[PDB]
Design a protein around this ligand. Structure first.
Ligand SMILES: [Mg+2]
Lengths: 45, 55, 48, 55, 48, 96, 346, 225
DNA sequence: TATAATGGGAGCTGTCACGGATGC
DNA sequence: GCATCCGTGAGTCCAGGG
């Protein structure tokens, strides 16, 4: 479930860069995903 | 003297201006290189006082 | 006597603790080792 | 309580959802009484006039 | 893979997404050096 | 916290106990010389290491903090004397 | 309730310009600005003053404030005086006043009609440290700039020209406001370039890059130490009210000791020091004790020069130096005898 | 819905000007004003148009409320509510009493009603909302600094937008935002959604939060320490 | 500084007594 | 006035924190 939330944020970033721009890698910023997993594994109850 | 009572009341704009030692005009805090307070911002020694005693 | 330019900021055994030193780890920058920005070295001491 | 305004009315004025009149200067919408609450459409009518474009 | 609907152009790549923590043999995790357990949660089941 | 070389909490209920004993000076020490009365704590340490008796407490700092935080809420909180004349707990340091 | 729902409604009130209405308003703006220029030529007043008075009359006395560039406080009295100096002009000159008023009204209407384009641009700059509404307002500032700088003769639509200034104003705001410790714009650019470089390197490396790999990829001028120092300068503060643990029990601030005020131990050590220095000083004569005190600043906080202590005691600078030295000689002899000041030296 | 008035010479009123019946439009006063409205000088059509509208004074926001509160005469209102206390209906006596409690609180205190509106917002001394470098040189700071910075940015942008005569919609948005920023500084989450720092759901800690509750200044630092 | 571009996303869930506020 | 429908602030002590 936290992975799904991180992926949803990643997809929002993808759609954002799909509007502003002239590659899959260029379109994909992994940071939100990495942030969500980390947030799950460190600061969850 | 000796404290005997404690009053609480609305503060008027003029009362508030009398408290103030300066208007804070800039949203800055401290300078990112010197770590000293920016002028006219939230930590300005010009307004709120010196950071070091007598200096 | 000239006042020195550095002061003592050493790691000391806190009150009520102590024992035998059994390991030290020493990670210093410039050595497959990279620490968060601005720290030159970390030292860890294990006491049993 | 002081001004005899309800919670909804005070919100609508305070957060820019409705106007309130301090001088109707002889307006008419039954004329305009002081301390009356007019929507932006109503206030636009009374302050700038009625009009409409048709294609 | 990125497809432009009108051009038909298709670009494909393997992109790196970061890291996923692995469970050790005994069922725990190693998050920033410290062992951690994800504790199961009980809740009301979905349904009608 | 032990790691911060911390002090013990003398909470609301500990205060009630001292009040119920009428131990007024013990309690005033807990609230001033032993916590956040700055000149009080300095002067009490000095008096003890000199073998003198502890001085009379003055205002705790956290009440000064409370006054300033209420001033930020647009409230004027004034310590008066029996003739209703202001008393400055900030010793001039905050009046232009 | 929801302020952006409210603002989207207010914006949906004004309908969208047709090409014809667009061009008409832009034309009226250009010509009104030219008319203000001509009115300055005629009247000898200040084009800014005239623009402000025309604006004051178009807008109303509801919005009539002072302007920072104007040399004269814009007060209804002065705007009435200037409006009367204007209204007294001949018909062929007073023609330009009607031109200018028409221009200002067109300007307001052109902004208001293009408020939606700002929203459609600003919805894409979220999550970068500014609230949605804050981005909308900064973009609105960009739109105002656009309206004042547009040239309808070029036959480009307004949207094209306005998007450039709107992006300009949104990005300027993000880089001027997003950080609690404000960082100059060019440094923000360097920091963000460093971020993108690191991200490209990780995407090719399957892990995070070292300082050195980042330095390579940033090219010449960049070594590892400069990368590290930039990352250090980029660190944002963390909140004192950050929760420590599950409950609302404790906050990060709870564990931060005050390093500034002297501890009760330090204060008492300073006090025992002052008293022991006075004790040891009383073993000298009034003059050698006093000379030492003036020369070390133990009296008025500052250390006087030998010439000042000498002029005070009515004696040569050499004489005062010699009596300072014998005072020190006496202090050292006594201190070696009793060892009463040693422990204060650390 | 406008009234047209053709002219044959120089007109005495310019576009934007506001006019009441009996006002001198043009032709040396030959053409006058019939209806209340707003002047639009059409040079192409050579007519002085007047769109029918009153010069009504209706405001929004704390400026309006501050005016109305400045205007209150407390003695007069007290007299009226005492007259209201003689009413038969129990509910009207209830309402009059509740209002009169506030009226006489302001009367006996010496406070002014309008002081419930802020013009100058106070700023807490910086050592009560510190910016401190922890061990390691990294920085920690109170949420109040971010709440103040929001307020200051919104105010400064409002002063600039007023200088450029921005359209009303824009000023109204900015003013709504200024009210909410003051509201978040003083009592975050009381009206609306709480302000949070980016990348966190935690509400910033406001001045009200500092005083109240088991963790507030009173119970945590003044009734025990 | 100019092709043209014109209204957003997120929710979110097993409490309770009580003072004040809205419908009857 | 007479009920209902709302918001809101509250919940022992200590410790440590990952
Ligand atoms: Mg290099």
């Amino acid at each position: 479930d936290q992975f799904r939330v991180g992926l949803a944020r990643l997809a929002r970033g993808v759609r954002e860069r799909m509007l502003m721009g002239s590659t899959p890698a260029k379109l994909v910023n992994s940071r939100p995903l990495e942030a969500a997993i980390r947030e799950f594994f460190s600061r969850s109850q | 003297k000796e404290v005997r009572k404690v009053r609480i009341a609305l503060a008027s704009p003029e009362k508030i201006r009398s408290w103030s030692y300066g208007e804070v005009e800039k949203p800055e805090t401290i300078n990112y290189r010197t770590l000293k307070p920016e002028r006219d911002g939230l930590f300005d020694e010009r307004i709120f006082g010196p950071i070091k005693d007598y200096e | 006597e000239k006042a020195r330019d550095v002061k003592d900021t050493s790691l000391r055994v806190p009150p009520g603790e102590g024992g035998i030193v059994v390991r030290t780890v020493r990670l210093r920058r410039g050595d497959g080792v990279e620490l968060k920005p601005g720290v030159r070295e970390v030292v860890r001491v294990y006491v049993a | 309580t002081l001004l005899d305004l309800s919670a909804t009315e005070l919100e609508q004025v305070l957060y820019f959802s409705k106007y309130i009149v301090l001088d109707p200067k002889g307006a008419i919408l039954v004329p305009v009484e002081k301390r009356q609450l007019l929507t932006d459409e109503e206030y636009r009518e009374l302050r700038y006039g009625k009009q409409e474009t048709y294609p | 893979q990125l497809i432009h609907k009108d051009t038909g152009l298709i670009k494909e790549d393997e992109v790196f997404l970061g890291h996923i923590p692995l469970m050790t043999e005994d069922g725990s995790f190693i998050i920033n050096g410290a062992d951690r357990v994800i504790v199961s949660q009980i809740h009301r089941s979905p349904g009608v | 916290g032990k790691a911060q070389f911390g002090g013990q909490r003398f909470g609301e209920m500990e205060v009630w106990a001292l009040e119920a004993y009428g131990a007024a000076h013990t309690l005033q020490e807990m609230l001033t010389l032993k916590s956040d009365d700055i000149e009080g704590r300095n002067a009490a340490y000095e008096a003890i290491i000199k073998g003198e008796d502890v001085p009379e407490p003055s205002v705790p700092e956290s009440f000064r903090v409370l006054v300033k935080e209420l001033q930020a809420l647009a409230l004027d909180v004034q310590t008066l004397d029996e003739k209703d004349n202001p008393v400055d707990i900030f010793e001039g340091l905050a009046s232009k | 309730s929801d302020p952006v729902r409210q603002y989207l409604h207010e914006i949906g009130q004004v309908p969208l310009l047709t090409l014809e209405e667009e061009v008409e308003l832009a034309r009226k703006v250009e010509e009104g600005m030219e008319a203000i220029k001509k009115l300055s030529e005629i009247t000898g007043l200040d084009p800014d003053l005239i623009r402000e008075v025309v604006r004051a009359k178009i807008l109303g006395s509801a919005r009539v404030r002072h302007i920072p560039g104007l040399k004269e406080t814009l007060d209804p009295k002065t705007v009435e005086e200037i409006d009367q100096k204007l209204k007294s002009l001949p018909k062929e000159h007073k023609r330009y006043l009607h031109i200018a008023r028409e221009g200002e009204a067109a300007r307001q209407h052109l902004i208001e009609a293009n408020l939606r384009l700002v929203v459609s641009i600003a919805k894409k700059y979220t999550g970068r440290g500014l609230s949605f509404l804050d981005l909308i307002q900064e973009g609105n500032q960009g739109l105002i700039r656009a309206v004042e700088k547009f040239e309808y003769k070029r036959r480009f639509k307004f949207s094209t020209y306005a998007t450039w200034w709107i992006r300009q104003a949104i990005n300027r705001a993000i880089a001027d406001q997003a950080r609690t410790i404000r960082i100059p714009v060019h440094m923000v650019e360097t920091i963000n370039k460093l971020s993108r470089t690191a991200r490209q390197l990780q995407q090719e490396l399957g892990r995070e890059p070292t300082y050195e790999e980042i330095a390579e990829a940033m090219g010449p001028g960049w070594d590892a130490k400069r990368v590290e120092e930039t990352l250090k300068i980029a660190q944002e503060p963390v909140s004192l009210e950050t929760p420590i643990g599950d409950e609302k029990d404790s906050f990060y601030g709870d564990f931060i000791p005050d390093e500034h005020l002297p501890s009760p131990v330090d204060a008492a050590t300073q006090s025992l020091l002052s008293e022991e220095l006075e004790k040891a000083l009383s073993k000298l004569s009034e003059r050698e004790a006093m000379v030492l005190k003036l020369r070390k600043g133990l009296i008025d906080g500052r250390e006087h020069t030998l010439e000042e202590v000498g002029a005070f005691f009515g004696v040569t600078r050499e004489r005062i130096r010699q009596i300072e030295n014998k005072a020190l000689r006496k202090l050292k002899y006594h201190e070696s005898r009793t060892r009463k000041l040693r422990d204060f030296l650390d | 819905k406008a009234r047209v008035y053709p002219f044959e010479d120089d007109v005495e009123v310019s576009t934007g000007d506001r006019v009441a019946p009996g006002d001198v439009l043009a032709d040396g006063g030959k053409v006058k004003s019939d209806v209340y409205g707003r002047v639009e000088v059409d040079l192409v059509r050579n007519v002085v148009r007047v769109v029918e509208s009153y010069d009504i004074d209706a405001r929004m926001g704390a400026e309006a409320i501050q005016q109305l509160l400045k205007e209150l005469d407390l003695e007069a209102l007290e007299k009226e509510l005492l007259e209201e206390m003689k009413h038969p209906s129990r509910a009207r006596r209830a309402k009059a009493r509740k209002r009169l409690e506030v009226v006489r609180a302001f009367l006996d205190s010496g406070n002014r009603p309008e002081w419930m509106i802020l013009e100058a917002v106070p700023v807490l001394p910086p050592d009560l909302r510190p910016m401190v470098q922890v061990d390691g040189g990294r920085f920690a700071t109170s949420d109040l600094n971010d709440l103040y910075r929001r307020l200051i940015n919104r105010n400064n942008r409002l002063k600039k937008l007023l200088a450029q005569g921005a359209p009303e919609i824009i000023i109204r948005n900015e003013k709504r935002m200024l009210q909410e920023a003051v509201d978040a500084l003083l009592d975050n989450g009381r009206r609306g959604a709480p302000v949070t720092n980016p990348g966190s759901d935690r509400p910033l800690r406001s001045l009200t939060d500092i005083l109240s509750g088991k963790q507030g200044r009173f119970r945590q630092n003044l009734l025990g320490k």
